[PDB]
Every structure is written in structure tokens, then in C-alpha cells.
Amino acid sequence: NLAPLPPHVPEHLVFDFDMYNPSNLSAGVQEAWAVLQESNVPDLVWTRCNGGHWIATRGQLIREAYEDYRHFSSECPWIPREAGEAFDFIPTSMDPPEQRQFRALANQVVGMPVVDKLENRIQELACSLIESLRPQGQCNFTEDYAEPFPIRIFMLLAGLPEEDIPHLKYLTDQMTRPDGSMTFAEAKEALYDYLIPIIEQRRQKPGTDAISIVANGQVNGRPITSDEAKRMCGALLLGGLDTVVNFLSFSMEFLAKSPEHRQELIERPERIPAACEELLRRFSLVADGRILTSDYEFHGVQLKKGDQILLPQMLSGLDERENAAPMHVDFSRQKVSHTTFGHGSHLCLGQHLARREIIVTLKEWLTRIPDFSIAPGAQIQHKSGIVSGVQALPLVWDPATTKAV
Numbered sequence: 001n002l003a004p005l006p007p008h009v010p011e012h013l014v015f016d017f018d019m020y021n022p023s024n025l026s027a028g029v030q031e032a033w034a035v036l037q038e039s040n041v042p043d044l045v046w047t048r049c050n051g052g053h054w055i056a057t058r059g060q061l062i063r064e065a066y067e068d069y070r071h072f073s074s075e076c077p078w079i080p081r082e083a084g085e086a087f088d089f090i091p092t093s094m095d096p097p098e099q100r101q102f103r104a105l106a107n108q109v110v111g112m113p114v115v116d117k118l119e120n121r122i123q124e125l126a127c128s129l130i131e132s133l134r135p136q137g138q139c140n141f142t143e144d145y146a147e148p149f150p151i152r153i154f155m156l157l158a159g160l161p162e163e164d165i166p167h168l169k170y171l172t173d174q175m176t177r178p179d180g181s182m183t184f185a186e187a188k189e190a191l192y193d194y195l196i197p198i199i200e201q202r203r204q205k206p207g208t209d210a211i212s213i214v215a216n217g218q219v220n221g222r223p224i225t226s227d228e229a230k231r232m233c234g235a236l237l238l239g240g241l242d243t244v245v246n247f248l249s250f251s252m253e254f255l256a257k258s259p260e261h262r263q264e265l266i267e268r269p270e271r272i273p274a275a276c277e278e279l280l281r282r283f284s285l286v287a288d289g290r291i292l293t294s295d296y297e298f299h300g301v302q303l304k305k306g307d308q309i310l311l312p313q314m315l316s317g318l319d320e321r322e323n324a325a326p327m328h329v330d331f332s333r334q335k336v337s338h339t340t341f342g343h344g345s346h347l348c349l350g351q352h353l354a355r356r357e358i359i360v361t362l363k364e365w366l367t368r369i370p371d372f373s374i375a376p377g378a379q380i381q382h383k384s385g386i387v388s389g390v391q392a393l394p395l396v397w398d399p400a401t402t403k404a405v
């Protein structure tokens with residue numbers, strides 16, 4: 001259950017937070033993680049759960065640690081330790097300076113330019129998907145939109161057949177929110193098994209998809225290996241198969257329970273981008289960490305070489321020391337401060353594709369289905385992990401109140 005407290009960790013800084021099953025999970029994931037920012041919780045605590053590790057609970061500690069890659073390496077960014085040791089995706093598991101040459105190549109396949117090309121296809125799928133649901137007066141948001149909308153776009157960018165989705169979605173899920181059926185190492189191996197033949201095929205007959213680009217690309221001049229390409233594609237898959245999907249559910253869940261917020265975006269649609277950003281703050285969902293490369297005293301606390309430290313990207317924006325009334329959603333918030341797409345040299349390369357997908361969704365959905373509620377009596381369940389998510393979101397609505405385009 002609880003790993004014995006290392007001799008160097010102070011007894012008074014112990015807070016046994018379980019990142020995969022947080023005590024207040026019923027109150028909502030963010031609410032569950034926010035218990036870390038309650039009155040008597042220190043800036044940095046040690047939890048004996050999951051092998052034991054440090055956890056920065058406030059924004060400036062989280063931001064500072066992400067900026068200092070010399071002390072907080074991404075070498076072992078996953079918890080538990082054995083998962084963080086198996087974690088070898090590129091560029092996610094590399095620290096500057098070597099990280100840069102690989103990050104540039106990845107930025108070329110999912111970057112802004114790529115997003116602009118993909119826009120019209122993103123809108124079609126959004127509308128196509130929404131219009132088909134419109135008349136039914138109901139849906140299971142997670143499997144009827146949250147998943148297919150962003151995943152099909154990714155599989156399109158990657159040039160992978162949609163039939164592989166069930167298998168890939170399962171693998172990435174086990175990496176972020178393991179249900180126990182398989183370890184991170186096992187899921188990685190299976191993911192690599194999937195990619196190997198694809199990378200070599202795409203490398204023989206070069207296409208124009210993200211995978212072909214990576215497999216045939218160069219890192220600051222020299223040719224990328226078949227292995228480096230495999231570790232890079234893994235990162236891209238992990239990144240765009242699990243993230244946007246779960247976030248869309250947090251947003252739509254909130255919108256379903258908040259008609260005043262819905263009508264605001266209805267009457268004033270130009271504020272949608274702003275709402276997108278505020279929503280990304282309030283419903284941030286990623287939380288991974290770093291490993292100490294040497295003994296180091298951080299904020300009056302002695303950290304030992306090898307110690308793992310969870311730096312919850314999610315907690316920064318929920319930090320009342322960053323945003324007043326952090327748990328309150330305000331589309332007009334003056335300065336939306338957050339680290340939802342990370343901080344430092346590993347800033348999310350897919351943030352632009354993510355924002356686009358979120359904004360297009362808000363627009364097209366409210367345009368066709370402005371009024372909708374959560375199925376009556378439905379107890380919504382969140383799941384916690386490296387990436388938190390929503391188990392299911394049943395939505396209902398009167399078709400008579402909808403409008404086709």
C-alpha cells in the first residue's frame with residue numbers, strides 16, 4: 001500500500017496522494033487533485049503511494065521545476081518508477097540540448113502549418129458528426145464524439161486506417177489510466193510492435209502523412225534511425241489519441257450542467273476562443289513529472305538523486321495563487337494563467353491542433369444543439385492518472401430545439 005518513507009524525506013511533508021485513485025474523485029478529478037492546495041498542505045509533499053514520490057502542489061514550484069531541466073530530467077517522467085524507466089518516447093523523454101533536434105522534427109508534422117491544412121477536414125467531420133446526432137435527441141458523448149472526432153483526425157494526419165483505433169486507443173489508455181490488464185512496458189512493446197512494420201513500409205515508399213515524414217526525416221542534418229522514428233511516433237500517438245478526447249468530455253460535461261454558460265457562447269460566439277482557454281484552465285487534465293539528476297535543495301527541501309517528482313501541469317491553473325476563484329469558470333477572466341499544455345522546453349507540440357479541435361467543437365455543437373442536459377440521474381465518473389478522463393457522458397436534448405445547417 002504505502003512504500004516505507006525514505007530516511008531523507010521529512011515525516012511532516014508526507015501526504016499520501018494517490019494519482020491513480022484520489023480520495024475526492026467523486027467530487028470530480030480536478031476537485032480531487034485540488035485537495036493538494038487546501039489550507040494546510042505545503043508547497044511540496046511526499047506521498048508513499050505508487051512507490052513514493054514528491055509532488056509540487058503550487059504553480060511557481062511546478063513552473064520552476066519544468067524550467068530547470070538540469071535538475072529535473074524528463075528521462076524518467078512517468079510514475080510509477082518502472083513505467084518511467086520503460087518510458088522512452090521521443091522527444092518526451094529527452095532533456096535539452098539533445099531533445100531539440102528531435103522536437104523540431106516532431107513540430108514539423110503536427111505544427112500550426114499542418115493544422116491550417118487540416119482545418120477544413122476538421123470542420124467537416126465535426127459537422128458531419130454533429131448533424132447526424134442532432135435529430136436523435138441523445139448520445140453517449142464519449143463514444144459518439146469525444147473519441148471519433150479527434151482520433152479520426154489524428155489517424156488521418158498519421159495516415160493510419162481507422163480500424164486500428166480500438167487497439168491503439170486501448171494501448172494508450174493503459175499507459176495513462178491503467179486498468180490493470182497490462183503494465184506500461186507491456187503496452188509500449190505492443191505499440192512498438194504495431195509501428196515497426198508500418199515505419200519500414202512508409203520508409204520504402206515515402207508518403208505525405210506524419211509517419212512517413214518522421215520515418216524519412218532528418219534530425220539537424222543526419223538521417224533518423226528506424227528506432228528513433230518508432231520512439232517519436234509513439235510520442236505522437238500517446239499525445240493525440242488520449243488527450244483531446246478526454247478534455248472534450250470535461251468541457252461538454254460542464255456545458256451540459258451550465259445553461260447560463262451555454263447561452264453566453266450562443267449570444268456571443270466571438271468569445272468562444274476565450275472560453276476555450278478558460279476551459280483548458282479549469283479542466284486541465286495532464287500530470288506527469290521529472291527525476292532528480294543529483295541531490296538538490298528545492299524550496300527548503302532536500303531532494304535526493306533519483307527521487308521522482310510529480311509536477312501536475314493540472315494544478316497550476318487551479319492554484320488560487322495564479323487565478324482567483326480558480327474553481328469558478330469565467331469566460332471573461334482577464335488573465336487565464338495555466339500550464340495545461342506543459343511548461344518549459346517540452347511545451348505541447350499538439351496544442352495548436354488541440355485548440356482548433358476544441359474551438360470548432362464549441363462552435364458547431366452550440367450552433368446545432370444549443371440546449372442539452374446530462375441524462376437525468378446520471379452519475380458521471382471521472383478517472384485519474386497521467387491524463388485524467390471521463391468514463392461516460394450521456395447527453396439528452398429535445399430535437400425540436402435543434403437546428404440543421
Ligand code: HEM
Nearest residue numbers: 091092110239240243244247286340341342346348350354
Ligand atoms: C487537450 C489536449 C492536450 C493537452 C492538455 C496536452 C498536454 C501536454 C503536456 C502537459 C505535455 C508535456 C509533457 C512533459 O513536459 O512531460 C505535452 C507534450 C506533448 N504533446 Fe500535448 N497535449 C494535448 C494534445 C496533444 C495532441 C493532440 C498531440 C499530437 C498531435 C500532442 C502531442 C504532444 C507531444 C509530441 C508532446 C511532447 C513534446 C516534447 O516532449 O517536446 N499533444 N502535451
Ligand SMILES: [K+]
Nearest residue numbers: 075084085087
Ligand atoms: K526512461
